[PDB]
Amino acid sequence: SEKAGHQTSAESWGTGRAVARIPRVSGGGTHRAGQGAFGNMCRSGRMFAPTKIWRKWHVKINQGQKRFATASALAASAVAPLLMARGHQVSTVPEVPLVVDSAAVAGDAVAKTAAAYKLLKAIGAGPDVEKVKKSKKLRAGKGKMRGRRHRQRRGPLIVYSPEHDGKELVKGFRNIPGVETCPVDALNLLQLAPGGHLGRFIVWTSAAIKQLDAVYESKKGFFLPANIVSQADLSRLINSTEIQSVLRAPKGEARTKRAC
Amino acid sequence: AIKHNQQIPNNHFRKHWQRRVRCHFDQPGKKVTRRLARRAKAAALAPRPVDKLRPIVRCPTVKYNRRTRLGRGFTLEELKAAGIPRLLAPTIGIAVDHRRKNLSEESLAANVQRLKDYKARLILFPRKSNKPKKADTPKDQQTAETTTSLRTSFGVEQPLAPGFTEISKSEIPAGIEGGAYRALRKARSDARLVGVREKRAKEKAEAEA
Amino acid sequence: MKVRPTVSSSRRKARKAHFSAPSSVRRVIMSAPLSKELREKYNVRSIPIRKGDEVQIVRGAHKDKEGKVTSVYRLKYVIHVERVTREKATGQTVPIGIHPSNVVITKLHLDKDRENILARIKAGREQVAKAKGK
RNA sequence: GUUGACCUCGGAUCAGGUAGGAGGACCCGCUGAACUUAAGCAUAUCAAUAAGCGGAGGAAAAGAAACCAACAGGGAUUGCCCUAGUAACGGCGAGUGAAGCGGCAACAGCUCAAAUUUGAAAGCUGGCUUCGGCCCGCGUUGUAAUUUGGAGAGGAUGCUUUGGGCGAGGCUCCUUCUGAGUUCCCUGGAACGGGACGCCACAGAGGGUGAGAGCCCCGUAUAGUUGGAAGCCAAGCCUGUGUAAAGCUCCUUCGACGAGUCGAGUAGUUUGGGAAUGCUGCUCAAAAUGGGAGGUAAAUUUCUUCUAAAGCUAAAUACCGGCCAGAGACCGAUAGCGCACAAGUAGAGUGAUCGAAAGAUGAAAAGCACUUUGAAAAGAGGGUUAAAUAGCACGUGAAAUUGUUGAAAGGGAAGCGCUUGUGACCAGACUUGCGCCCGGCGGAUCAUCCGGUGUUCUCACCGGUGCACUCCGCCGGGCUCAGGCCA
RNA sequence: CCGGGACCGAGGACCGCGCUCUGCAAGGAUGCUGGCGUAAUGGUCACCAGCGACCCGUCUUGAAACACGGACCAAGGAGUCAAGGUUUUGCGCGAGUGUUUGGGUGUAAAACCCGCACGCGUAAUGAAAGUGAACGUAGGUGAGAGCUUCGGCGCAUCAUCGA
RNA sequence: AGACUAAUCGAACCAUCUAGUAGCUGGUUACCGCCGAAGUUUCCCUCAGGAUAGCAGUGUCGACCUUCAGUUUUAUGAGGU
RNA sequence: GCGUGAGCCCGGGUCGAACGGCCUCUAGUGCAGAUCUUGGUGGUAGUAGCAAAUACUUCAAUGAGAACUUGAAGGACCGAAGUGGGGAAAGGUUCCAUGUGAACAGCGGUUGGACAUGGGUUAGUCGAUCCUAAGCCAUAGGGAAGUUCCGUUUCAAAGGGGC
RNA sequence: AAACUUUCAACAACGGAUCUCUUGGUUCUGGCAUCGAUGAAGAACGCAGCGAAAUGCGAUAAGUAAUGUGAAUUGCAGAAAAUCAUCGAAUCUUUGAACGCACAUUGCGCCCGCCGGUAUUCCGGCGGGCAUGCCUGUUCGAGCGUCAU
Ligand SMILES: [Mg+2]
Ligand SMILES: [Mg+2]
Ligand SMILES: [Mg+2]
Ligand SMILES: [Mg+2]
Ligand SMILES: [Mg+2]
Ligand SMILES: [Mg+2]
Ligand SMILES: [Mg+2]
Ligand SMILES: [Mg+2]
Ligand SMILES: [Mg+2]
Ligand SMILES: [Mg+2]
Ligand SMILES: [Mg+2]
Ligand SMILES: [Mg+2]
Ligand SMILES: [Mg+2]
Ligand SMILES: [Mg+2]
Ligand SMILES: [Mg+2]
Ligand SMILES: [Mg+2]
Ligand SMILES: [Mg+2]
Ligand SMILES: [Mg+2]
Ligand SMILES: [Mg+2]
Ligand SMILES: [Mg+2]
Ligand SMILES: [Mg+2]
Ligand SMILES: [Mg+2]
Ligand SMILES: [Mg+2]
Ligand SMILES: [Mg+2]
Ligand SMILES: [Mg+2]
Ligand SMILES: [Mg+2]
Ligand SMILES: [Mg+2]
Ligand SMILES: [Mg+2]
Ligand SMILES: [Mg+2]
Ligand SMILES: [Mg+2]
Ligand SMILES: [Mg+2]
Ligand SMILES: [Mg+2]
Ligand SMILES: [Mg+2]
Ligand SMILES: [Mg+2]
Ligand SMILES: [Mg+2]
Ligand SMILES: [Mg+2]
Ligand SMILES: [Mg+2]
Ligand SMILES: [Mg+2]
Ligand SMILES: [Mg+2]
Ligand SMILES: [Mg+2]
Ligand SMILES: [Mg+2]
Ligand SMILES: [Mg+2]
Ligand SMILES: [Mg+2]
Ligand SMILES: [Mg+2]
Ligand SMILES: [Mg+2]
Ligand SMILES: [Mg+2]
Ligand SMILES: [Mg+2]
Ligand SMILES: [Mg+2]
Ligand SMILES: [Mg+2]
Ligand SMILES: [Mg+2]
Ligand SMILES: [Mg+2]
Ligand SMILES: [Mg+2]
Ligand SMILES: [Mg+2]
Ligand SMILES: [Mg+2]
Ligand SMILES: [Mg+2]
Ligand SMILES: [Mg+2]
Ligand SMILES: [Mg+2]
Ligand SMILES: [Mg+2]
Ligand SMILES: [Mg+2]
Ligand SMILES: [Mg+2]
Ligand SMILES: [Mg+2]
Ligand SMILES: [Mg+2]
Ligand SMILES: [Mg+2]
Ligand SMILES: [Mg+2]
Ligand SMILES: [Mg+2]
Ligand SMILES: [Mg+2]
Ligand SMILES: [Mg+2]
Ligand SMILES: [Mg+2]
Ligand SMILES: [Mg+2]
Ligand SMILES: [Mg+2]
Ligand SMILES: [Mg+2]
Ligand SMILES: [Mg+2]
Ligand SMILES: [Mg+2]
Ligand SMILES: [Mg+2]
Ligand SMILES: [Mg+2]
Ligand SMILES: [Mg+2]
Ligand SMILES: [Mg+2]
Ligand SMILES: [Mg+2]
Ligand SMILES: [Mg+2]
Ligand SMILES: [Mg+2]
Ligand SMILES: [Mg+2]
Ligand SMILES: [Mg+2]
Ligand SMILES: [Mg+2]
Ligand SMILES: [Mg+2]
Ligand SMILES: [Mg+2]
Ligand SMILES: [Mg+2]
Ligand SMILES: [Mg+2]
Ligand SMILES: [Mg+2]
Ligand SMILES: [Mg+2]
Ligand SMILES: [Mg+2]
Ligand SMILES: [Mg+2]
Ligand SMILES: [Mg+2]
Ligand SMILES: [Mg+2]
Ligand SMILES: [Mg+2]
Ligand SMILES: [Mg+2]
Ligand SMILES: [Mg+2]
Ligand SMILES: [Mg+2]
Ligand SMILES: [Mg+2]
Ligand SMILES: [Mg+2]
Ligand SMILES: [Mg+2]
Ligand SMILES: [Mg+2]
Ligand SMILES: [Mg+2]
Ligand SMILES: [Mg+2]
Ligand SMILES: [Mg+2]
Ligand SMILES: [Mg+2]
Ligand SMILES: [Mg+2]
Ligand SMILES: [Mg+2]
Ligand SMILES: [Mg+2]
Ligand SMILES: [Mg+2]
Ligand SMILES: [Mg+2]
Ligand SMILES: [Mg+2]
Ligand SMILES: [Mg+2]
Ligand SMILES: [Mg+2]
Ligand SMILES: [Mg+2]
Ligand SMILES: [Mg+2]
Ligand SMILES: [Mg+2]
């Protein structure tokens, strides 16, 4: 509150009364009289530098950088080691860029949670869904008083084409814990890299996979970035003939014997 | 107290600025409210477009002289030339501006053609369905794909003139005789010296008597 | 997950409403399930408990005890069951407060009002089932 | 001559009405500081702010140009972005500081004075009235119709225009109704915990229930539905009718347009407004293509742009003051509002005013019957509870400080560092593990071969074979190797 | 050249210098033996003993000060936030760059998408009217990393003479 | 008598402006590692304070160029203690 | 037990419902001081002290308990400008009866202006009420932006008697 | 050697820190526009079977009517719903802008009507009225201000 700690008429007593020069509540007949009133070190006083609403709560991010981050997260989602390192259960997933026929989700095919659950189990997201189900815990903080009562892991993210698949699949997948859906044309970085960690497990539909290229071609002012390296296999580069044939002979070994 | 090589500070915070800080945490909520109001007014104007027809207008100053935009309303002369009565124009979605004038045939003709296209595309339902008049759409061409946004369907087609154009050689115009730079210098000098030359000429003319 | 703007998921508000609800709202709050036989008979799952109902306790230290509801202390959100009692130091017998959600109704006190209730619930449930089965 | 008019001015507890106060977060005005900054201080700044006064609403205010401009011209008001920390102001110091254009949100236009209805005050308040009208009064010192500069008035001219009633159907509103375990086992006082087996999910938001409950209960999702009131919109229908009124196309002519007002001087204040931006006081005091403005004072000559001195008007904008509602990377009883509680309370002051402290037994009072000692408070037994060292001085229960018990030291402080000693009390390490021979027991693969799969394509696995001078394991004996502490 | 004593044993296959060369005292300790295998070693605490040891914080040239504050304990308690500026990090795009005033859209304060204008930059200079940037392969000289066909080509940058 | 004006008088009390300003006093909260000062110059109504240069840290970059030096030697000037 | 250290981990006891590690994000994030704030608690310390107003004593009753309860007796003081009997202001139930654990009566307490439960204030003649005083507030008017100021009979058409 | 002081430990005190909790704050966002002479806000005094306060209410007083729900309230007692929700009908003490004049007084008046005491006049009981500024209208008036007979 703007007026917290200031709703008093306290004045300092000055020196010469053997008390500190802090402002003191005037009057009598109550415990409050004669007590320090205004400083940050005083009980019932004003906090130091009271928090203001005009703090910079939001962060402006370049749209180009947002689109790079989204593209990088999408690329990381296609790497199986990254999914496991992010904690997804993908040992039974048939293929890392997991694509399910849009005929299995289109219209009212998975409009019911039972049907959606059966489809996820069939395609191999069942272990991840069960991991989310079993991970539910009570929060350790004071967020229990503030509405964040339970914590749980993230599950598969279902990406679909709303133009071709409809939106009944959203209702079908809504109630399964840890499973969230996103239209292919509105991909969210907060979901593609939860907590800033890359490798979200994604279940695509065939229509969404078909539409992804057009989605990225329709972005005005953005082109997919060119990497600063061409070959990421450092072992291949270093142990290729082109490099190894011009090196000088090694001047030592991994271990050096002690001479003196 | 400056201490190094600093730009001289001039932050106007010597009043009690905190008393008048305007944050904007209500930006998304206000956008939602605006969208709701737009939807409600569009529903109220059920078959009509949500806006009025506006004329093409040239921005005033020597800056922005090159660009056109939408104006407030059509002039009385433009309405008369298009054949739309003054009292009938605002009741069929046409904005009327009584204080704008048509100083140029180009603007007059452009706005008249705009009004004529709008009138050609207008579908006028009868006041009473059971007795349509001769000025209303006769119930057969009353079904068509309509537009609800005149600002988009009747926008400024090209605010600026085309910046690129190709002409064949030997059609290249001959330059100003003394050159463009000299011509500008001469025009400037004449504008500067118009008054002095005038007074000198009249003085020399009257010197005889 | 809640969607409707009129619904609030505030723990503080929910607790305040529950613990300051008026008597008529506390009546609905203190509902109890019907037995399997009554549920099959009436096509009704739960009903607000009433004095004179016959219940069986299915939770707590007094499980399997049956008896008639002798009082519905809304102010304390409890019911009193016949012969489900305790002894003070003086040996005087006092009833033990049982939450209605910890009991099942084995026999209902039925009068037209208590029944218009059951008919409304049955008709609503049957209609909802039919509409979902369309 | 008196009465009778009308002109002013009065009476009445005459008939009917209206205003005050509250609220004042936001809004419209008036009035109006100083602290402060200038490293002093007076102009300046704080600030056209605080305090004081008057007046409204859900918004207020502003508002349809006596505008901006100088362009190829824009076109009521308001607000956001930008213009722009710019033009400018300023002991030209400190510091201050707009506007036009441009993009957007929202868009809405209008009515009076100034004219003769003059072939008919055609207008209005009040009372009575069957509803047709009547009467009084207001009003000609002007109430209606027409007209508002975008014009209009007057004429031509031929076209064109209009009033009422339903109304399916839809959107609202109130109301009835909503899926699934309390199945088995263990812990527990109590499962809402763990394990097993199931179910619902457009509902796995939230809360309660004796501990972390989608399926025990309230609720939660979804469009539906039961009954009802009738609030809105509305496709389309039904039906009057041109005396009257209304628009357009042309036109000689006419074409009313706001005065102690504009403007000027001076004074004060204010502004970025600078030979004077607005406002106000005083003095002077207009005109009719006149007048204002065109950011340098003046005369002269042009040009541009509007048309003051009368008035109304949604929206986009401010505001959490009031009434509701939803939320949070907020605080968590010295925090968060002064107030989580009979808090603006108790209490203080003559008064204006000042103004606290203070949440938690337990799932359930089951809040300790009874015996005994005591004058009593209480104690000791006993009882309740999962628990009483949870007993209304009640969850947990720190430190300061204190009592008892045990150990120790102490010839005018104590504490502390390095280093032994004594006494007390302790953590580790070890109590084996590797191999190799000689016996016993058990088993079936141990090599090889055949077939089938996999895979890193030559390396394995699985079956069939093997079948005891193999292989594996467990005991018993001997030997080897290493392995603790101090020397 | 012979003795007597003390402290220490870092490293962990070979590799090397070498010598008195079947080996060695030569690029860092091994061999043999004994007692015990537990409070024995060792740690902790209390006390005695030898030596040492002024009360902290602060201002100050100088504090143990006869300088000030501090009886004790628990909890609270002091470089924050916003705007503007600057330099240096890390990013994206790059002669451009900046979506989020606004609009569209949404699983609804999120995320996603859109563009006109505008800001900054792309040109300076003068008070202003105004004018406004190639003689050269965008110059010559000396350096200059790196390349080089080994003759010079010469980045950044510095000094210098010019346009 | 600068006396008295509610224990308050060389200008009462209450609330607010107000968290008034202070070149002045006091305080300013975990650890380790590396580097490491100044009380001097010029200007200031400057003398208990600032700016300015110096001393210090950090971050770099350049070919870290074959140069640099609180030093000696040699050769050659100046000085008035 | 680990770490140079801030600290981290474990054993035992108490206790009763939530909590932690890792990588990022975030801040109202680390106390011995500020004559710091609030609260609590010490030594001093069973210490200073409880000494103005002449003063108490005997027997009995009551009671667990009697110097400060009561009865009787004695001895004393106030000595009619009283320590007497009634009032004004002010207080508000302190008045009366009954009962009484704790707290208060700076010792005690059976007693009390304390605590608890019940009662108690009767007016034509006593006061208020009526009158006017100093004075205050209206009105008519006049000022003031206004809250309001003056005005009290003043530049006012301001009433009461009968048939 | 005790006592005393100090140190260390266990238990017991004192005190209320720590942990956990939260029908409370704080901040943001969304919807809405509704006080009063038809007497508001605020104040006082009263009202329950057993209440001091808080909450609610006004002599119809912990509330009445009406509608909805459908069996309680609860500390005890009592009885045949409810300390329920909703809320369109009422009641609404003394006050307060506060209005007969006053008020530091439960003070002092006047008018109309009714009912009693022999009563138009006095007394008593009851009910309804009596403020100011201003507007419109009504009626009664004033003025050689003025017009005709
Ligand atoms: Mg506080
Ligand atoms: Mg200030
Ligand atoms: Mg009247
Ligand atoms: Mg009146
Ligand atoms: Mg008012
Ligand atoms: Mg100053
Ligand atoms: Mg100063
Ligand atoms: Mg001064
Ligand atoms: Mg000012
Ligand atoms: Mg004010
Ligand atoms: Mg509005
Ligand atoms: Mg208005
Ligand atoms: Mg006009
Ligand atoms: Mg114009
Ligand atoms: Mg405009
Ligand atoms: Mg000026
Ligand atoms: Mg200013
Ligand atoms: Mg614009
Ligand atoms: Mg009438
Ligand atoms: Mg349900
Ligand atoms: Mg059990
Ligand atoms: Mg629970
Ligand atoms: Mg279980
Ligand atoms: Mg639950
Ligand atoms: Mg005019
Ligand atoms: Mg004037
Ligand atoms: Mg002027
Ligand atoms: Mg003037
Ligand atoms: Mg002046
Ligand atoms: Mg002024
Ligand atoms: Mg002026
Ligand atoms: Mg000019
Ligand atoms: Mg006007
Ligand atoms: Mg006007
Ligand atoms: Mg207006
Ligand atoms: Mg508090
Ligand atoms: Mg406390
Ligand atoms: Mg407080
Ligand atoms: Mg008081
Ligand atoms: Mg407690
Ligand atoms: Mg026990
Ligand atoms: Mg305990
Ligand atoms: Mg306990
Ligand atoms: Mg406790
Ligand atoms: Mg202690
Ligand atoms: Mg010593
Ligand atoms: Mg030792
Ligand atoms: Mg085999
Ligand atoms: Mg030892
Ligand atoms: Mg020692
Ligand atoms: Mg010494
Ligand atoms: Mg000194
Ligand atoms: Mg010192
Ligand atoms: Mg000394
Ligand atoms: Mg000193
Ligand atoms: Mg000092
Ligand atoms: Mg001291
Ligand atoms: Mg705390
Ligand atoms: Mg602390
Ligand atoms: Mg910054
Ligand atoms: Mg640009
Ligand atoms: Mg220029
Ligand atoms: Mg080179
Ligand atoms: Mg004197
Ligand atoms: Mg006083
Ligand atoms: Mg005095
Ligand atoms: Mg004074
Ligand atoms: Mg004061
Ligand atoms: Mg050093
Ligand atoms: Mg000077
Ligand atoms: Mg000093
Ligand atoms: Mg000499
Ligand atoms: Mg000399
Ligand atoms: Mg518990
Ligand atoms: Mg802090
Ligand atoms: Mg402390
Ligand atoms: Mg310190
Ligand atoms: Mg203290
Ligand atoms: Mg003390
Ligand atoms: Mg003594
Ligand atoms: Mg004494
Ligand atoms: Mg004595
Ligand atoms: Mg005495
Ligand atoms: Mg006795
Ligand atoms: Mg005595
Ligand atoms: Mg005497
Ligand atoms: Mg005597
Ligand atoms: Mg006398
Ligand atoms: Mg007496
Ligand atoms: Mg007396
Ligand atoms: Mg008196
Ligand atoms: Mg008495
Ligand atoms: Mg007694
Ligand atoms: Mg005593
Ligand atoms: Mg006593
Ligand atoms: Mg007593
Ligand atoms: Mg007694
Ligand atoms: Mg008493
Ligand atoms: Mg008398
Ligand atoms: Mg009287
Ligand atoms: Mg009188
Ligand atoms: Mg007066
Ligand atoms: Mg007056
Ligand atoms: Mg020690
Ligand atoms: Mg305690
Ligand atoms: Mg806590
Ligand atoms: Mg009333
Ligand atoms: Mg009255
Ligand atoms: Mg009245
Ligand atoms: Mg009196
Ligand atoms: Mg009388
Ligand atoms: Mg009579
Ligand atoms: Mg009478
Ligand atoms: Mg009366
Ligand atoms: Mg009358
Ligand atoms: Mg007369």
Short mmCIF file of N, CA and C in Angstrom, two decimals, chain A residues 205-243:
data_model
loop_
_atom_site.label_atom_id
_atom_site.label_comp_id
_atom_site.label_asym_id
_atom_site.label_seq_id
_atom_site.Cartn_x
_atom_site.Cartn_y
_atom_site.Cartn_z
N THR A 205 0.21 -34.55 -36.03
CA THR A 205 -0.70 -35.14 -36.99
C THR A 205 -0.13 -34.97 -38.39
N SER A 206 -0.60 -35.82 -39.31
CA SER A 206 -0.10 -35.76 -40.68
C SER A 206 -0.42 -34.42 -41.33
N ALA A 207 -1.62 -33.89 -41.07
CA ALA A 207 -1.98 -32.59 -41.61
C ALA A 207 -1.09 -31.49 -41.05
N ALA A 208 -0.79 -31.54 -39.75
CA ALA A 208 0.09 -30.54 -39.15
C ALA A 208 1.49 -30.61 -39.74
N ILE A 209 2.01 -31.82 -39.94
CA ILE A 209 3.33 -31.97 -40.54
C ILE A 209 3.33 -31.44 -41.97
N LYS A 210 2.25 -31.71 -42.71
CA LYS A 210 2.14 -31.17 -44.07
C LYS A 210 2.09 -29.65 -44.07
N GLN A 211 1.45 -29.06 -43.07
CA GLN A 211 1.23 -27.62 -43.02
C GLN A 211 2.39 -26.84 -42.40
N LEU A 212 3.32 -27.52 -41.73
CA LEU A 212 4.39 -26.81 -41.03
C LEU A 212 5.26 -25.99 -41.98
N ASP A 213 5.58 -26.55 -43.15
CA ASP A 213 6.42 -25.83 -44.11
C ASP A 213 5.74 -24.55 -44.58
N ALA A 214 4.44 -24.62 -44.89
CA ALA A 214 3.71 -23.43 -45.30
C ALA A 214 3.60 -22.44 -44.15
N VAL A 215 3.45 -22.94 -42.92
CA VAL A 215 3.41 -22.06 -41.76
C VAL A 215 4.69 -21.25 -41.67
N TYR A 216 5.83 -21.91 -41.84
CA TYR A 216 7.09 -21.19 -41.72
C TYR A 216 7.40 -20.35 -42.96
N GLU A 217 6.84 -20.70 -44.11
CA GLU A 217 7.01 -19.86 -45.29
C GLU A 217 6.11 -18.63 -45.28
N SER A 218 5.05 -18.64 -44.48
CA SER A 218 4.14 -17.51 -44.40
C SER A 218 4.58 -16.45 -43.39
N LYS A 219 5.71 -16.64 -42.72
CA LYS A 219 6.17 -15.69 -41.71
C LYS A 219 6.92 -14.56 -42.39
N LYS A 220 6.36 -13.35 -42.35
CA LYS A 220 6.93 -12.21 -43.05
C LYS A 220 8.14 -11.68 -42.29
N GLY A 221 9.24 -11.46 -43.02
CA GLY A 221 10.44 -10.93 -42.42
C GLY A 221 11.31 -11.93 -41.70
N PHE A 222 10.96 -13.22 -41.74
CA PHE A 222 11.74 -14.26 -41.08
C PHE A 222 12.09 -15.35 -42.08
N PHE A 223 13.36 -15.72 -42.12
CA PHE A 223 13.82 -16.89 -42.85
C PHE A 223 14.58 -17.79 -41.89
N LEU A 224 14.53 -19.09 -42.15
CA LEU A 224 15.18 -20.04 -41.26
C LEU A 224 16.68 -19.75 -41.20
N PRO A 225 17.27 -19.67 -40.02
CA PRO A 225 18.64 -19.15 -39.90
C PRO A 225 19.66 -20.07 -40.54
N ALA A 226 20.75 -19.46 -41.00
CA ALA A 226 21.89 -20.20 -41.50
C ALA A 226 22.90 -20.39 -40.37
N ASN A 227 23.27 -21.64 -40.12
CA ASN A 227 24.18 -21.93 -39.03
C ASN A 227 25.59 -21.45 -39.35
N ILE A 228 26.37 -21.21 -38.29
CA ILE A 228 27.76 -20.80 -38.47
C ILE A 228 28.68 -21.97 -38.76
N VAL A 229 28.20 -23.20 -38.62
CA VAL A 229 28.94 -24.38 -39.04
C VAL A 229 28.06 -25.17 -39.99
N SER A 230 28.70 -25.94 -40.86
CA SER A 230 28.00 -26.78 -41.82
C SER A 230 27.94 -28.24 -41.38
N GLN A 231 29.05 -28.78 -40.90
CA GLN A 231 29.13 -30.15 -40.41
C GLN A 231 29.28 -30.11 -38.90
N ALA A 232 28.34 -30.73 -38.19
CA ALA A 232 28.38 -30.76 -36.74
C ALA A 232 29.16 -31.94 -36.18
N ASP A 233 29.62 -32.86 -37.04
CA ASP A 233 30.40 -34.01 -36.59
C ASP A 233 31.86 -33.60 -36.47
N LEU A 234 32.21 -33.11 -35.28
CA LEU A 234 33.58 -32.69 -35.02
C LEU A 234 34.55 -33.85 -35.18
N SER A 235 34.14 -35.06 -34.79
CA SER A 235 34.99 -36.23 -34.99
C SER A 235 35.26 -36.45 -36.47
N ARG A 236 34.23 -36.34 -37.30
CA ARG A 236 34.41 -36.53 -38.74
C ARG A 236 35.36 -35.49 -39.31
N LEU A 237 35.18 -34.23 -38.91
CA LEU A 237 36.06 -33.17 -39.41
C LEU A 237 37.50 -33.40 -38.99
N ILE A 238 37.72 -33.71 -37.71
CA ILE A 238 39.08 -33.81 -37.18
C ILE A 238 39.79 -35.04 -37.73
N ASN A 239 39.08 -36.16 -37.86
CA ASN A 239 39.68 -37.40 -38.30
C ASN A 239 39.52 -37.64 -39.80
N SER A 240 39.04 -36.66 -40.55
CA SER A 240 39.03 -36.77 -42.00
C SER A 240 40.45 -36.73 -42.55
N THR A 241 40.60 -37.22 -43.78
CA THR A 241 41.92 -37.24 -44.41
C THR A 241 42.41 -35.83 -44.73
N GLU A 242 41.49 -34.93 -45.09
CA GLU A 242 41.89 -33.59 -45.50
C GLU A 242 42.64 -32.87 -44.39
N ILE A 243 42.25 -33.10 -43.14
CA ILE A 243 42.93 -32.48 -42.01
C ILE A 243 44.10 -33.33 -41.53
#
